[PDB]
Design an enzyme around this catalytic site. Sequence first.
Site, PDB file in Angstrom:
ATOM      1  N   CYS B 155     -34.649   1.781  18.492  1.00  0.00           N
ATOM      2  CA  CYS B 155     -35.477   1.885  17.258  1.00  0.00           C
ATOM      3  C   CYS B 155     -35.497   0.571  16.489  1.00  0.00           C
ATOM      4  O   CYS B 155     -36.415   0.415  15.680  1.00  0.00           O
ATOM      5  CB  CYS B 155     -35.062   3.030  16.339  1.00  0.00           C
ATOM      6  SG  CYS B 155     -34.939   4.619  17.247  1.00  0.00           S
ATOM      7  N   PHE B 206     -38.621  12.854  17.841  1.00  0.00           N
ATOM      8  CA  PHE B 206     -39.252  11.755  18.618  1.00  0.00           C
ATOM      9  C   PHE B 206     -40.683  12.089  18.986  1.00  0.00           C
ATOM     10  O   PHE B 206     -40.940  13.144  19.530  1.00  0.00           O
ATOM     11  CB  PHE B 206     -38.438  11.392  19.872  1.00  0.00           C
ATOM     12  CG  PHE B 206     -37.098  10.784  19.574  1.00  0.00           C
ATOM     13  CD1 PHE B 206     -36.998   9.656  18.773  1.00  0.00           C
ATOM     14  CD2 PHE B 206     -35.936  11.290  20.143  1.00  0.00           C
ATOM     15  CE1 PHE B 206     -35.758   9.086  18.503  1.00  0.00           C
ATOM     16  CE2 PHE B 206     -34.695  10.722  19.866  1.00  0.00           C
ATOM     17  CZ  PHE B 206     -34.608   9.646  19.013  1.00  0.00           C
ATOM     18  N   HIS B 294     -37.424   1.947   8.851  1.00  0.00           N
ATOM     19  CA  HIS B 294     -37.620   2.701  10.109  1.00  0.00           C
ATOM     20  C   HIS B 294     -37.445   4.178   9.784  1.00  0.00           C
ATOM     21  O   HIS B 294     -36.371   4.581   9.334  1.00  0.00           O
ATOM     22  CB  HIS B 294     -36.643   2.260  11.192  1.00  0.00           C
ATOM     23  CG  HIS B 294     -36.742   3.158  12.361  1.00  0.00           C
ATOM     24  ND1 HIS B 294     -37.884   3.229  13.116  1.00  0.00           N
ATOM     25  CD2 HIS B 294     -35.872   4.033  12.897  1.00  0.00           C
ATOM     26  CE1 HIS B 294     -37.724   4.158  14.051  1.00  0.00           C
ATOM     27  NE2 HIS B 294     -36.491   4.654  13.952  1.00  0.00           N
ATOM     28  N   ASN B 327     -40.676  10.011  14.671  1.00  0.00           N
ATOM     29  CA  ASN B 327     -39.926   8.802  15.029  1.00  0.00           C
ATOM     30  C   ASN B 327     -40.476   8.274  16.372  1.00  0.00           C
ATOM     31  O   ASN B 327     -40.245   8.924  17.432  1.00  0.00           O
ATOM     32  CB  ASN B 327     -38.457   9.177  15.101  1.00  0.00           C
ATOM     33  CG  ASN B 327     -37.550   8.033  15.469  1.00  0.00           C
ATOM     34  OD1 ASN B 327     -37.997   7.025  16.009  1.00  0.00           O
ATOM     35  ND2 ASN B 327     -36.274   8.184  15.124  1.00  0.00           N
TER      36      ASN B 327
HETATM   37  C1  LIG Z   1     -31.822  16.699  11.963  1.00  0.00           C
HETATM   38  C2  LIG Z   1     -32.223  16.784  10.482  1.00  0.00           C
HETATM   39  C3  LIG Z   1     -33.750  16.676  10.381  1.00  0.00           C
HETATM   40  C4  LIG Z   1     -31.798  18.143   9.927  1.00  0.00           C
HETATM   41  O1  LIG Z   1     -31.814  18.095   8.460  1.00  0.00           O
HETATM   42  P1  LIG Z   1     -30.526  18.569   7.609  1.00  0.00           P
HETATM   43  O2  LIG Z   1     -30.869  18.334   6.174  1.00  0.00           O
HETATM   44  O3  LIG Z   1     -29.236  18.054   8.168  1.00  0.00           O
HETATM   45  O4  LIG Z   1     -30.562  20.149   7.885  1.00  0.00           O
HETATM   46  P2  LIG Z   1     -29.383  21.234   7.889  1.00  0.00           P
HETATM   47  O5  LIG Z   1     -28.063  20.531   7.732  1.00  0.00           O
HETATM   48  O6  LIG Z   1     -29.840  22.294   6.935  1.00  0.00           O
HETATM   49  O7  LIG Z   1     -29.497  21.804   9.382  1.00  0.00           O
HETATM   50  C5  LIG Z   1     -29.732  20.865  10.437  1.00  0.00           C
HETATM   51  C6  LIG Z   1     -29.066  21.381  11.680  1.00  0.00           C
HETATM   52  O8  LIG Z   1     -28.966  20.290  12.632  1.00  0.00           O
HETATM   53  C7  LIG Z   1     -27.608  20.036  12.914  1.00  0.00           C
HETATM   54  N1  LIG Z   1     -27.465  18.608  13.205  1.00  0.00           N
HETATM   55  C8  LIG Z   1     -27.940  17.555  12.442  1.00  0.00           C
HETATM   56  N2  LIG Z   1     -27.660  16.387  12.980  1.00  0.00           N
HETATM   57  C9  LIG Z   1     -26.976  16.683  14.158  1.00  0.00           C
HETATM   58  C10 LIG Z   1     -26.419  15.871  15.173  1.00  0.00           C
HETATM   59  N3  LIG Z   1     -26.425  14.539  15.142  1.00  0.00           N
HETATM   60  N4  LIG Z   1     -25.831  16.497  16.223  1.00  0.00           N
HETATM   61  C11 LIG Z   1     -25.771  17.842  16.221  1.00  0.00           C
HETATM   62  N5  LIG Z   1     -26.253  18.704  15.322  1.00  0.00           N
HETATM   63  C12 LIG Z   1     -26.852  18.057  14.304  1.00  0.00           C
HETATM   64  C13 LIG Z   1     -26.864  20.556  11.689  1.00  0.00           C
HETATM   65  O9  LIG Z   1     -25.489  20.759  11.935  1.00  0.00           O
HETATM   66  C14 LIG Z   1     -27.638  21.859  11.467  1.00  0.00           C
HETATM   67  O10 LIG Z   1     -27.338  22.864  12.439  1.00  0.00           O
HETATM   68  P3  LIG Z   1     -26.865  24.297  11.807  1.00  0.00           P
HETATM   69  O11 LIG Z   1     -28.110  24.931  11.162  1.00  0.00           O
HETATM   70  O12 LIG Z   1     -26.355  25.116  12.982  1.00  0.00           O
HETATM   71  O13 LIG Z   1     -25.744  24.029  10.806  1.00  0.00           O
HETATM   72  C15 LIG Z   1     -31.511  15.690   9.649  1.00  0.00           C
HETATM   73  O14 LIG Z   1     -30.088  15.886   9.676  1.00  0.00           O
HETATM   74  C16 LIG Z   1     -31.803  14.252  10.059  1.00  0.00           C
HETATM   75  O15 LIG Z   1     -32.736  13.634   9.569  1.00  0.00           O
HETATM   76  N6  LIG Z   1     -31.019  13.666  10.941  1.00  0.00           N
HETATM   77  C17 LIG Z   1     -31.550  12.545  11.696  1.00  0.00           C
HETATM   78  C18 LIG Z   1     -31.005  11.236  11.282  1.00  0.00           C
HETATM   79  C19 LIG Z   1     -30.715  10.556  12.609  1.00  0.00           C
HETATM   80  O16 LIG Z   1     -29.579  10.583  13.071  1.00  0.00           O
HETATM   81  N7  LIG Z   1     -31.706   9.975  13.311  1.00  0.00           N
HETATM   82  C20 LIG Z   1     -31.400   9.143  14.472  1.00  0.00           C
HETATM   83  C21 LIG Z   1     -32.606   8.615  15.211  1.00  0.00           C
HETATM   84  S1  LIG Z   1     -32.331   6.949  15.889  1.00  0.00           S
HETATM   85  O1  LIG Z   2     -33.329   8.834  23.962  1.00  0.00           O
HETATM   86  C1  LIG Z   2     -34.050   8.206  23.171  1.00  0.00           C
HETATM   87  C2  LIG Z   2     -35.516   8.520  22.985  1.00  0.00           C
HETATM   88  C3  LIG Z   2     -36.253   7.240  22.689  1.00  0.00           C
HETATM   89  C4  LIG Z   2     -37.732   7.401  22.538  1.00  0.00           C
HETATM   90  C5  LIG Z   2     -38.290   7.816  21.328  1.00  0.00           C
HETATM   91  C6  LIG Z   2     -39.668   7.918  21.177  1.00  0.00           C
HETATM   92  C7  LIG Z   2     -40.482   7.734  22.296  1.00  0.00           C
HETATM   93  O2  LIG Z   2     -41.845   7.872  22.220  1.00  0.00           O
HETATM   94  C8  LIG Z   2     -39.923   7.348  23.512  1.00  0.00           C
HETATM   95  C9  LIG Z   2     -38.558   7.175  23.624  1.00  0.00           C
HETATM   96  O3  LIG Z   2     -35.729   6.660  21.466  1.00  0.00           O
HETATM   97  C10 LIG Z   2     -34.377   6.456  21.455  1.00  0.00           C
HETATM   98  C11 LIG Z   2     -33.899   5.510  20.571  1.00  0.00           C
HETATM   99  C12 LIG Z   2     -32.539   5.272  20.517  1.00  0.00           C
HETATM  100  O4  LIG Z   2     -32.141   4.318  19.623  1.00  0.00           O
HETATM  101  C13 LIG Z   2     -31.659   5.944  21.364  1.00  0.00           C
HETATM  102  C14 LIG Z   2     -32.147   6.889  22.235  1.00  0.00           C
HETATM  103  O5  LIG Z   2     -31.308   7.541  23.074  1.00  0.00           O
HETATM  104  C15 LIG Z   2     -33.533   7.177  22.299  1.00  0.00           C
END
Ligand SMILES: CC(C)(COP(=O)(O)OP(=O)(O)OC[C@H]1O[C@@H](n2cnc3c(N)ncnc32)[C@H](O)[C@@H]1OP(=O)(O)O)[C@@H](O)C(=O)NCCC(=O)NCCS
Ligand SMILES: O=C1C[C@@H](c2ccc(O)cc2)Oc2cc(O)cc(O)c21
Lengths: 382, 381
Positions: B155, B206, B294, B327
């Site tokens: 990302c 995603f 992001h 995302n």
């Molecule tokens: C996933 C998301 C949309 C859920 O929103 P939230 O405000 O946490 O919602 P809640 O806590 O009410 O419930 C979310 C659920 O997802 C679970 N969860 C959230 N993040 C998790 C993770 N990394 N692994 C496992 N479970 C996860 C929570 O435990 C919960 O499950 P439950 O209902 O059984 O308790 C939010 O946590 C979020 O934006 N996380 C993403 C941030 C992130 O790590 N992005 C990385 C991309 S590079």
């Molecule tokens: O496993 C994935 C999915 C990937 C992804 C997202 C959007 C899309 O269109 C294609 C691929 O993005 C990521 C980004 C990360 O930093 C680590 C990850 O593990 C991943």
Amino acid sequence: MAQRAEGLATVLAIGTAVPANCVYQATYPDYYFRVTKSEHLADLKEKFQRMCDKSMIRKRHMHLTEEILIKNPKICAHMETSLDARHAIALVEVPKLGQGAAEKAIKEWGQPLSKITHLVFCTTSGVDMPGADYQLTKLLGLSPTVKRLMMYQQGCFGGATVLRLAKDIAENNRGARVLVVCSEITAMAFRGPCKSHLDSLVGHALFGDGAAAAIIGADPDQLDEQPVFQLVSASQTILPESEGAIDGHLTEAGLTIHLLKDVPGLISENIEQALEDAFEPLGIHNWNSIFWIAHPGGPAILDRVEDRVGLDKKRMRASREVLSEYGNMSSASVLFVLDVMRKSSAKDGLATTGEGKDWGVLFGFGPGLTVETLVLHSVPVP
Amino acid sequence: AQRAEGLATVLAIGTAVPANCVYQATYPDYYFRVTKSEHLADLKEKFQRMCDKSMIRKRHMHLTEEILIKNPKICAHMETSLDARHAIALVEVPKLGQGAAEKAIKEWGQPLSKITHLVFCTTSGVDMPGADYQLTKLLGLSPTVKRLMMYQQGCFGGATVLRLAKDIAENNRGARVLVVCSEITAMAFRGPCKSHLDSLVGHALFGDGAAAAIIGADPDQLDEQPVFQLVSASQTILPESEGAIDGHLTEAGLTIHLLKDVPGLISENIEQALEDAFEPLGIHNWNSIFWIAHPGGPAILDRVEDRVGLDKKRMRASREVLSEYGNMSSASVLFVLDVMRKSSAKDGLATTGEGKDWGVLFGFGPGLTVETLVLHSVPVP
Ligand SMILES: CC(C)(COP(=O)(O)OP(=O)(O)OC[C@H]1O[C@@H](n2cnc3c(N)ncnc32)[C@H](O)[C@@H]1OP(=O)(O)O)[C@@H](O)C(=O)NCCC(=O)NCCS
Ligand SMILES: O=C1C[C@@H](c2ccc(O)cc2)Oc2cc(O)cc(O)c21
Ligand SMILES: CC(C)(COP(=O)(O)OP(=O)(O)OC[C@H]1O[C@@H](n2cnc3c(N)ncnc32)[C@H](O)[C@@H]1OP(=O)(O)O)[C@@H](O)C(=O)NCCC(=O)NCCS
Ligand SMILES: O=C1C[C@@H](c2ccc(O)cc2)Oc2cc(O)cc(O)c21
């Protein structure tokens, strides 16, 4: 304007590392057909013997041993599901071999780790997130604020590409010191032989393991740093009518190579145009008046380039010594050639790091078909 | 005189998404149906709560039920499927990149012969020759274009390509860098599993997309109109973040692993990133700058907003991209940049950056890595 460097990106140190396991080319057809349990493929083995006899390789270094192959029989098959077993080796060994090369370059350079502002890591040997750049940052203890570029699945021109990247970083950022590392482990590509894939058989005659590292910076300290080469210009081109000449696929069975057309003929018939495009602006037209760092892809590429361009036998000597002692190490090879060139130049008492010449050319070759051309300048030897 | 004089500038931005649009409201039902996972009722309820909190309205996905029916190994949690995934992504990544690049080139208006460099970034499959080569062929770029192929980036890749383009454009007089980030979730899409709730999070967030920009220093007064200036670029690995975000390319495709508090790690370190970037410029009010964050998910944007004390308006462009696209990994920040300048012009504001002079762009990814760019807006009549 005061945030940028003044002079040319310069190579300030070069270090190299290879796996300790050394495989001799003379006995390799027997070894390869025995460990892959392929000795009933006797006509294929004779074809492989002729490829190894013409390879002009004496030895290669290979992380992969018979002990590892016995624990990983699916790596010995031509095309079995094996990527996970291959990654379990390569994702550890690539940054560790890169560490070996980087420690030697850093020791030559003699400055503290804290002065490294950028890292460029290049490989063709597996992919992961976070990358080999992260892994090496942790292994060496670089600053967590090091600016990283992770160059994955690059192929044999990657050594040229990391110098082109480092040149722009070093020139555009005053004080920048770029660590570049190329590291290759054949465990990603090693497989059993098959009559339907004679191009894979060529790869098994040529490819070896190795890592090379350099420190690149502009405005070197007059007393505390020692220039080895200057990076003057970098160009890249896709050769006409070369579609599919070199393809490399990362599959469920690991990294596989595909050759079409005539790779040595395509490169040799286009190299003079690359020389003219690079050297005409400097008024240079005699290709025997420059030193040569040619990616040692195999003996046929070096032979056809030498023949078509009209080179004296000595121009390709450093490239051929790398081919002899290490085989084709993909992106790392040209940094090995640079190292051999400056060491043998000093040993033979010549006046510059480039065999006594002022100007030099570095070529990488790979998928596209891509030719990368760098103009280099030597530095005086006392 | 072989080098440029001024700052690297964004001269154009284009975006493209697969036409196939999946609505988040119906997604838990769709996802559990097409992965034949309707027996996992408790997992489906956890997925429903993830989708409800996602703040995503829709995503674009190349992967359709027709393609999933022809590729059942992709629907399992962890079956041998990399070859089937590559057969889709190695074609669609450069094709979607072509869509974004053609739109940026149209905005820029210069001949293709002026493009001297191409930087292609993806997290969606690898090949040799790369997506950079494929796009060069699709667009008709010069065979002498200087390419950088940025594979398996994650990302923060959108920030990384701008960092790369800045040094290329500033160091090379006349250079015009096409940067393209293109992501296809076919590499990562899989069935749900009780043991891998972090994979479930990925399936809620995603989406697919590509973005392209043209970068150059010393824009021609008559022929080029700047959008944003690239002032500085920094990168850091966050303390105590080992293993927070891992991504493995396996026999079963791309798998994601989350092993900490990603929103807490980013939000606890962002103010130090702002100070390192902006203290040299004498800037201290984080509400006086525009924000290109992001949109990794709603919890990252919420925790950063809360920790830094942002007005709700600062994250508006980032949340609009999260809402309308999810995302898109490395492509997302270029979508945010495009939304920021378009909505700035629509609201009649005096700069491309919501009427502010200075802005910040953050990418986040594996490491945990934070990339910080300082931007400058340009005046709008
Ligand atoms: C996933 C998301 C949309 C859920 O929103 P939230 O405000 O946490 O919602 P809640 O806590 O009410 O419930 C979310 C659920 O997802 C679970 N969860 C959230 N993040 C998790 C993770 N990394 N692994 C496992 N479970 C996860 C929570 O435990 C919960 O499950 P439950 O209902 O059984 O308790 C939010 O946590 C979020 O934006 N996380 C993403 C941030 C992130 O790590 N992005 C990385 C991309 S590079
Ligand atoms: O496993 C994935 C999915 C990937 C992804 C997202 C959007 C899309 O269109 C294609 C691929 O993005 C990521 C980004 C990360 O930093 C680590 C990850 O593990 C991943
Ligand atoms: C393989 C090599 C070391 C020795 O070959 P040579 O000097 O041409 O010797 P010969 O052609 O007499 O015999 C070599 C054998 O390899 C075969 N061969 C060479 N290149 C081949 C290819 N790409 N695919 C299939 N077979 C090939 C020949 O057909 C011949 O087989 P034979 O003896 O059963 O007829 C040499 O051909 C070479 O350097 N190849 C090019 C280097 C290259 O492609 N590098 C790519 C790195 S990306
Ligand atoms: O299939 C491979 C093997 C790879 C490689 C060589 C040496 C090494 O140590 C590790 C990997 O180099 C390549 C380089 C290419 O341009 C195309 C390819 O297909 C390959």
